[PDB]
JSON list of C-alpha atoms and ligand atoms in Angstrom, two decimals:
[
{"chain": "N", "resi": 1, "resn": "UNK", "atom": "CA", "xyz": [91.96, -62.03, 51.00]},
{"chain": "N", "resi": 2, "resn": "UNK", "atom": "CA", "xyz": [94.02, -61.39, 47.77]},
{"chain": "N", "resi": 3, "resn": "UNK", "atom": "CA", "xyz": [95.33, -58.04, 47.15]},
{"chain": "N", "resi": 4, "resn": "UNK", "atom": "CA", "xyz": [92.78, -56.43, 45.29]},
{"chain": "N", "resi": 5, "resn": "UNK", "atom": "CA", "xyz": [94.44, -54.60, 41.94]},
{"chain": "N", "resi": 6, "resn": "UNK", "atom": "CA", "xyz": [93.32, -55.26, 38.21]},
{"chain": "N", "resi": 7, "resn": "UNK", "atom": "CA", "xyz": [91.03, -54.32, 35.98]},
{"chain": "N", "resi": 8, "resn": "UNK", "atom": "CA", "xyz": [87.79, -56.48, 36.22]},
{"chain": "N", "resi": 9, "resn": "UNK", "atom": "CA", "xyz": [86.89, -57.81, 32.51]},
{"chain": "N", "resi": 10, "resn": "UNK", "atom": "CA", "xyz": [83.80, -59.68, 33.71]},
{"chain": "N", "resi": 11, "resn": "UNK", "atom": "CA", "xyz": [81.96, -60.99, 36.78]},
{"chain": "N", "resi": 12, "resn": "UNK", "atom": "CA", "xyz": [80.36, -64.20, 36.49]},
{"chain": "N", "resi": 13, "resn": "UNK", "atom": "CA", "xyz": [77.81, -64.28, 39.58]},
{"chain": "N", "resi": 14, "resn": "UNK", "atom": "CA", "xyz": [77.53, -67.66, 41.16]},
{"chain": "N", "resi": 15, "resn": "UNK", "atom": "CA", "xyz": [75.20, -66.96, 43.89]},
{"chain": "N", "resi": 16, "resn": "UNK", "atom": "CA", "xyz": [74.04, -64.19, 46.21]},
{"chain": "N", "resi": 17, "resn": "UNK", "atom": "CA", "xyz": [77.28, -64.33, 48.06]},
{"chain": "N", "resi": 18, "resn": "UNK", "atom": "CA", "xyz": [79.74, -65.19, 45.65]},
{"chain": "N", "resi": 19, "resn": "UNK", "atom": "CA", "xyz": [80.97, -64.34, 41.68]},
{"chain": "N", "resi": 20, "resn": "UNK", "atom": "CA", "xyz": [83.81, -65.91, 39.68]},
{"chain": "N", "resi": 21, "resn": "UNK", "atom": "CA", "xyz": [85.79, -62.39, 38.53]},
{"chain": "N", "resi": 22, "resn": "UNK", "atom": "CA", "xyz": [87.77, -62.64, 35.35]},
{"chain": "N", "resi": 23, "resn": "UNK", "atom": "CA", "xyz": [90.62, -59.59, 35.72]},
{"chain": "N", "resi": 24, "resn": "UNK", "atom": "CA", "xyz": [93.59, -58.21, 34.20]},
{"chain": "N", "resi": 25, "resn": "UNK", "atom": "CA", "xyz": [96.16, -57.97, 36.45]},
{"chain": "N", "resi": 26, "resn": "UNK", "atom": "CA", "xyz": [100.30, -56.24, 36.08]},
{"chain": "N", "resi": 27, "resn": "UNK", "atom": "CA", "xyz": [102.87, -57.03, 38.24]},
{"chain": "N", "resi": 28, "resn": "UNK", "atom": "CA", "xyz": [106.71, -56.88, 37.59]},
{"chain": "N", "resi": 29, "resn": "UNK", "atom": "CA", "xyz": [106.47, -55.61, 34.21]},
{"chain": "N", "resi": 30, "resn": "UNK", "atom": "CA", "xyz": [104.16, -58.54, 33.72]},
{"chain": "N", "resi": 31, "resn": "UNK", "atom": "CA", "xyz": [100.44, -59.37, 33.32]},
{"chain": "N", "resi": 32, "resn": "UNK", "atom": "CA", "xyz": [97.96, -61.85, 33.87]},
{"chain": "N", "resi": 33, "resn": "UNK", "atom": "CA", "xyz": [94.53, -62.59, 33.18]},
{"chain": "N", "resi": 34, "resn": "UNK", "atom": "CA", "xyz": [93.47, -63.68, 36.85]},
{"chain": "N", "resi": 35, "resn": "UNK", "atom": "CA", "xyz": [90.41, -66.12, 37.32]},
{"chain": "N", "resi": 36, "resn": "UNK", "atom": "CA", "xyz": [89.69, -66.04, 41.20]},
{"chain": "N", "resi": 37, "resn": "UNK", "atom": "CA", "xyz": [86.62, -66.67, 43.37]},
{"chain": "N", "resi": 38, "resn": "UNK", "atom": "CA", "xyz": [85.54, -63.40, 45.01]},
{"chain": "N", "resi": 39, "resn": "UNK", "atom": "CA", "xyz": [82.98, -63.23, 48.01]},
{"chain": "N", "resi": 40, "resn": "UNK", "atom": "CA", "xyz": [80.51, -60.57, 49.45]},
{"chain": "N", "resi": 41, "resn": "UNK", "atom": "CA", "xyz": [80.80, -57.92, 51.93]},
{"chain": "N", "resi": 42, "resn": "UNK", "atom": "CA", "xyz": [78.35, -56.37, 54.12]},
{"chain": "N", "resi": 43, "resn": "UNK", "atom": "CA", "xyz": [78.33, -53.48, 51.65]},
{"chain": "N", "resi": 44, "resn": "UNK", "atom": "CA", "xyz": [77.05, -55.21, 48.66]},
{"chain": "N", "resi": 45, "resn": "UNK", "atom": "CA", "xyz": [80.54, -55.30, 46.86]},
{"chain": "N", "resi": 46, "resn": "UNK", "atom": "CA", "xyz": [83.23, -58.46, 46.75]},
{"chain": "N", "resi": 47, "resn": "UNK", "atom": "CA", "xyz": [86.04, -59.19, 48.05]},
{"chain": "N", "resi": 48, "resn": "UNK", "atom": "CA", "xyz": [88.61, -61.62, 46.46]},
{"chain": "N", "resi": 49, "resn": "UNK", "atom": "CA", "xyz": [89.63, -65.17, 47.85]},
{"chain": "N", "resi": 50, "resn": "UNK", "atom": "CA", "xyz": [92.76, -67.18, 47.14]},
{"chain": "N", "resi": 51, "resn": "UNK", "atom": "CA", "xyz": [90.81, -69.59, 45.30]},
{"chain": "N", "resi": 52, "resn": "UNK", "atom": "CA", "xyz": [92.25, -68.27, 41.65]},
{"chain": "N", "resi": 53, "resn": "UNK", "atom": "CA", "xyz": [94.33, -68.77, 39.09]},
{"chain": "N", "resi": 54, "resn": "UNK", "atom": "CA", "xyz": [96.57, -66.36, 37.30]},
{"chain": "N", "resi": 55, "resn": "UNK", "atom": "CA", "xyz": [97.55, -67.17, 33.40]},
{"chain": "N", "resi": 56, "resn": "UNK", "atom": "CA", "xyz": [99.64, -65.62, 31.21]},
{"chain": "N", "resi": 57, "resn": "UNK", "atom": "CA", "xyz": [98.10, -64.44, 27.69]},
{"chain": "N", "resi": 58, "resn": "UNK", "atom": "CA", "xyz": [99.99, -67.20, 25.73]},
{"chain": "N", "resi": 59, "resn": "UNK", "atom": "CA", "xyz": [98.20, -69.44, 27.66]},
{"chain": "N", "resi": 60, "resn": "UNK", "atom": "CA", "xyz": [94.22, -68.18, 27.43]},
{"chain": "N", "resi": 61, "resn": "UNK", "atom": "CA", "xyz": [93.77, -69.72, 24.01]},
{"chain": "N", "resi": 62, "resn": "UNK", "atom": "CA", "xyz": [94.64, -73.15, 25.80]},
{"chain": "N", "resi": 63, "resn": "UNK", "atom": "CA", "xyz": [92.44, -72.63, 28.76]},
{"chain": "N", "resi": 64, "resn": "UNK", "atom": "CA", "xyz": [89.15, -71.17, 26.30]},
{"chain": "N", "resi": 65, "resn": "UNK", "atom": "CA", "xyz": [89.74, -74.35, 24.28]},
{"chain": "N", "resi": 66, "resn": "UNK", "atom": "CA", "xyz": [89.89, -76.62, 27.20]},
{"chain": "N", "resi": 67, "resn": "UNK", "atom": "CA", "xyz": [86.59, -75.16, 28.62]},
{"chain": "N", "resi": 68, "resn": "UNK", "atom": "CA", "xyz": [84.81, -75.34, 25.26]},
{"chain": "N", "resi": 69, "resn": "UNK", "atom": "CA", "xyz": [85.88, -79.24, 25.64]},
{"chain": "N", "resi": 70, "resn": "UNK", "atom": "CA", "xyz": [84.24, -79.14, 28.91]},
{"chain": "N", "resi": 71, "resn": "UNK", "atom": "CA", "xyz": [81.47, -77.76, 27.52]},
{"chain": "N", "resi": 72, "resn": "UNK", "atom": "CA", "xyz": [80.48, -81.22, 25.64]},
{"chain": "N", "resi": 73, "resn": "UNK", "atom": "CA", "xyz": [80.40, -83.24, 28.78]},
{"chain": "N", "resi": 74, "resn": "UNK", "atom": "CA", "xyz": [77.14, -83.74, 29.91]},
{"chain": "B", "resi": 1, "resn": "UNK", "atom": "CA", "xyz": [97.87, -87.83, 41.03]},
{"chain": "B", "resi": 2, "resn": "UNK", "atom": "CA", "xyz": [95.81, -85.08, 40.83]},
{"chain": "B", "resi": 3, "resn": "UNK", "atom": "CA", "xyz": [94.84, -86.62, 37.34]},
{"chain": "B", "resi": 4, "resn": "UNK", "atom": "CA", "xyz": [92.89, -89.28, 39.39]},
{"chain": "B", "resi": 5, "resn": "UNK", "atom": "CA", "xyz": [90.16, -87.14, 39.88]},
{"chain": "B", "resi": 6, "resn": "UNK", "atom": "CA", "xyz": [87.46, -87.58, 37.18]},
{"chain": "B", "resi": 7, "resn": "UNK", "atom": "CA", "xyz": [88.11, -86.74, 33.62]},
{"chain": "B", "resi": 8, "resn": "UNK", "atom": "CA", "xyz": [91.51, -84.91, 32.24]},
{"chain": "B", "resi": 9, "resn": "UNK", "atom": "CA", "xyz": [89.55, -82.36, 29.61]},
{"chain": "B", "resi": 10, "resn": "UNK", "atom": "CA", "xyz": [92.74, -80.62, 29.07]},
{"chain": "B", "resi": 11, "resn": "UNK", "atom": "CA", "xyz": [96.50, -79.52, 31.06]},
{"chain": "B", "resi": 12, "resn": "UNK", "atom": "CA", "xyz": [98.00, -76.40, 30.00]},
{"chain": "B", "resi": 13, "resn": "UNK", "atom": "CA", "xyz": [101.26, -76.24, 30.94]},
{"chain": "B", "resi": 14, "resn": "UNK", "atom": "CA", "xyz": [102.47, -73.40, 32.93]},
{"chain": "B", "resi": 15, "resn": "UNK", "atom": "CA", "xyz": [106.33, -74.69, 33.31]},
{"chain": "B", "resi": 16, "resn": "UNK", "atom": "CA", "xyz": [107.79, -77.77, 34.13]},
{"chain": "B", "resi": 17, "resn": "UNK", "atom": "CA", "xyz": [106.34, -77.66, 37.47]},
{"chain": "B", "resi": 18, "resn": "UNK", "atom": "CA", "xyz": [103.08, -76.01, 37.13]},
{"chain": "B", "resi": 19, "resn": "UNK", "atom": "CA", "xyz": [100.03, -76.75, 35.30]},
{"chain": "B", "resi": 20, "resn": "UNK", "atom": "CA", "xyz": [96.14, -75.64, 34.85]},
{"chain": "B", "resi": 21, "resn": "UNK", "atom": "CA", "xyz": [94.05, -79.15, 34.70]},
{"chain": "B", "resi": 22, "resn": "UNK", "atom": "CA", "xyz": [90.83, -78.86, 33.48]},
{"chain": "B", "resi": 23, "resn": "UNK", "atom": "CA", "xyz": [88.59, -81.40, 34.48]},
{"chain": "B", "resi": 24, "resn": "UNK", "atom": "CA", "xyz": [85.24, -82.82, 34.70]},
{"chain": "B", "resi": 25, "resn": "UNK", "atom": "CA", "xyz": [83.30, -84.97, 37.14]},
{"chain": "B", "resi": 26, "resn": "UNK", "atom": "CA", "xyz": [80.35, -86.19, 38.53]},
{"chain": "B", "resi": 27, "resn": "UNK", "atom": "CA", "xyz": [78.80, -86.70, 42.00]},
{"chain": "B", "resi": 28, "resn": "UNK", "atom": "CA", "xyz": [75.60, -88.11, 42.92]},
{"chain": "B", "resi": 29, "resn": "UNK", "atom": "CA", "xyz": [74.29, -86.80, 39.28]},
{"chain": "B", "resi": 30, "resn": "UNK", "atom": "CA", "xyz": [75.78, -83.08, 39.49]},
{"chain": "B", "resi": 31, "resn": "UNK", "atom": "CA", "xyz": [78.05, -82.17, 36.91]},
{"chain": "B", "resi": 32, "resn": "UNK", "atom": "CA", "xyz": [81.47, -80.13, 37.93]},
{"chain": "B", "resi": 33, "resn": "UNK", "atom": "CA", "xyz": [84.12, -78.67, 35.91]},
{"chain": "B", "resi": 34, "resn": "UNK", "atom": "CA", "xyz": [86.94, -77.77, 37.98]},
{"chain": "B", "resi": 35, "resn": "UNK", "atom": "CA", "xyz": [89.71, -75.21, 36.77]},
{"chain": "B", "resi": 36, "resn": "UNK", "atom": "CA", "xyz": [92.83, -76.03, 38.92]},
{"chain": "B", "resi": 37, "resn": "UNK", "atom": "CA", "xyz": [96.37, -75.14, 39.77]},
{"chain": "B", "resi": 38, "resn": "UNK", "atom": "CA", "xyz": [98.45, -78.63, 39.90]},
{"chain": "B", "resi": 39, "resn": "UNK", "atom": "CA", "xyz": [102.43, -78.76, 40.99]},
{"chain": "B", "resi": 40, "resn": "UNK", "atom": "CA", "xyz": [104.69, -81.47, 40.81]},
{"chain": "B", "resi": 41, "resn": "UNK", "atom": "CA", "xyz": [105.53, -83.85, 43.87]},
{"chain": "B", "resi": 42, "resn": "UNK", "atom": "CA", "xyz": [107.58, -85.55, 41.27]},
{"chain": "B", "resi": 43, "resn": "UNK", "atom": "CA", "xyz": [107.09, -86.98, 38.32]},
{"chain": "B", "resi": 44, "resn": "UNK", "atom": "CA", "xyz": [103.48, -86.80, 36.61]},
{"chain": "B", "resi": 45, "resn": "UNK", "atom": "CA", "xyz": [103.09, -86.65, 40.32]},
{"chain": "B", "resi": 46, "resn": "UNK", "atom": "CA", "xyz": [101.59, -83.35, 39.87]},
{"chain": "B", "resi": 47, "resn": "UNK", "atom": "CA", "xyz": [99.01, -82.87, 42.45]},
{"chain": "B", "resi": 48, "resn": "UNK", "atom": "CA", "xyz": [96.50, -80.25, 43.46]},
{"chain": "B", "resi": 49, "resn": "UNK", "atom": "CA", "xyz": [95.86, -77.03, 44.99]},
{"chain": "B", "resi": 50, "resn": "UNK", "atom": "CA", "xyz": [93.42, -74.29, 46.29]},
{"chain": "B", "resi": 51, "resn": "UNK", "atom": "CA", "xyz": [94.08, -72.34, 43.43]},
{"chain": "B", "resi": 52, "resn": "UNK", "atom": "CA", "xyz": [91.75, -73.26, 41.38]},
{"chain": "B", "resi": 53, "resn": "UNK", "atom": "CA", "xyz": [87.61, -73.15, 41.01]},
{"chain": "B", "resi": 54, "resn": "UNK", "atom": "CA", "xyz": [84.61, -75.43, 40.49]},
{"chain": "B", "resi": 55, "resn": "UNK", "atom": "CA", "xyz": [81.62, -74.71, 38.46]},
{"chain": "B", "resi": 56, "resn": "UNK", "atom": "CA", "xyz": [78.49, -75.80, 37.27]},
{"chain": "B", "resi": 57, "resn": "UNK", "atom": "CA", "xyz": [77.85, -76.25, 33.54]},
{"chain": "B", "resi": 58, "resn": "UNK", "atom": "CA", "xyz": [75.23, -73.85, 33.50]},
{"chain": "B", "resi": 59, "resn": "UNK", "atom": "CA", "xyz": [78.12, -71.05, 33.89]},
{"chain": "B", "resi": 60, "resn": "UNK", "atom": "CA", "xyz": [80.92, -72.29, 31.62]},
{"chain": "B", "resi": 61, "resn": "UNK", "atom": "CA", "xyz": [79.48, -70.06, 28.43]},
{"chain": "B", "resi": 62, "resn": "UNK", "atom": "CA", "xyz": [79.68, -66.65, 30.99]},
{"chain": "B", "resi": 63, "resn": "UNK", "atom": "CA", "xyz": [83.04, -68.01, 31.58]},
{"chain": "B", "resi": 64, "resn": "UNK", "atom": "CA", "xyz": [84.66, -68.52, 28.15]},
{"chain": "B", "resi": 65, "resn": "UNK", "atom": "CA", "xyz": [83.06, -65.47, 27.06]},
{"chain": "B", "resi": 66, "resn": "UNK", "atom": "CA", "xyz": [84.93, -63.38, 29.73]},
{"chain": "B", "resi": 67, "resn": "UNK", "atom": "CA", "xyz": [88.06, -64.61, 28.64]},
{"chain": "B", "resi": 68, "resn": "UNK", "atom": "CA", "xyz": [87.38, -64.41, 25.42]},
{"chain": "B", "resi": 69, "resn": "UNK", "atom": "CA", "xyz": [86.64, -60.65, 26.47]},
{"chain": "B", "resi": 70, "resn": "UNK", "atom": "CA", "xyz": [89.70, -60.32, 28.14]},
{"chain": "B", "resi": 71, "resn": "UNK", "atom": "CA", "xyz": [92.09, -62.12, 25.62]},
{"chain": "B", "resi": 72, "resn": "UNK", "atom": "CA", "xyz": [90.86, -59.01, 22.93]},
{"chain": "B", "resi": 73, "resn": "UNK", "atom": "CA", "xyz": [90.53, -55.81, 24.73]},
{"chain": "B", "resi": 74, "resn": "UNK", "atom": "CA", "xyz": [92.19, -53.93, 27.69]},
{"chain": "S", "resi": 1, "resn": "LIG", "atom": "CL1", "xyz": [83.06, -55.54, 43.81]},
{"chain": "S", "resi": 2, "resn": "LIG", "atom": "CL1", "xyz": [90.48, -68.90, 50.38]},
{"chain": "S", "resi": 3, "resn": "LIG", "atom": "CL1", "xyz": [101.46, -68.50, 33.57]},
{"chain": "S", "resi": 4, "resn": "LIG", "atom": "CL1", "xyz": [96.29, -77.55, 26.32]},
{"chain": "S", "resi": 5, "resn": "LIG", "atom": "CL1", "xyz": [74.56, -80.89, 36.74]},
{"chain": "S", "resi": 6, "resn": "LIG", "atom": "CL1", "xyz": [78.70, -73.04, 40.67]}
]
């Protein structure tokens, strides 16, 4: 399981068992908007996979247009 | 090539050796848009990895509005 720091900006539940988490996340005087599938414990809360991606700012704009893109498939 | 694999929306480059494909596809009449970490073999060889997720349409607007969220604030 990935090591659990950042600041969680919004959790995007999938299912019962399982959320998309959108985080902020600083590391080596860096940070990163991390997108990662997280999954539940037996305490309710979640617990993050290595099924994620980690993007720097510059690049959100890129990755919000690509998904509004996405968006007209269908 | 991990750009066989349904429709290229959009590939934000990351460096020359690292990119986040968007993509869309369809199986058996279920949509999925897939949000992925590719790396080069060589070439446009770039090919996939775990690090990525798959969703189902129904989510994307949660999805661009978190990182929307997080490109503003924190
Ligand atoms: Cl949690
Ligand atoms: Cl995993
Ligand atoms: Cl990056
Ligand atoms: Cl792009
Ligand atoms: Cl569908
Ligand atoms: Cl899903």
């Amino acid at each position: 399981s990935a090591y659990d720091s950042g600041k969680t900006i919004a959790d995007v539940q999938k299912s019962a068992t399982q959320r998309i988490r959108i985080s902020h996340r600083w590391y080596r005087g860096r940070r990163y908007v991390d997108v990662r599938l997280v999954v539940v414990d037996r305490d309710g809360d979640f617990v993050p996979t290595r099924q994620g991606i980690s993007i720097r700012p510059e690049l959100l704009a890129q990755v919000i247009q690509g998904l509004l893109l996405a968006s007209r498939e269908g």
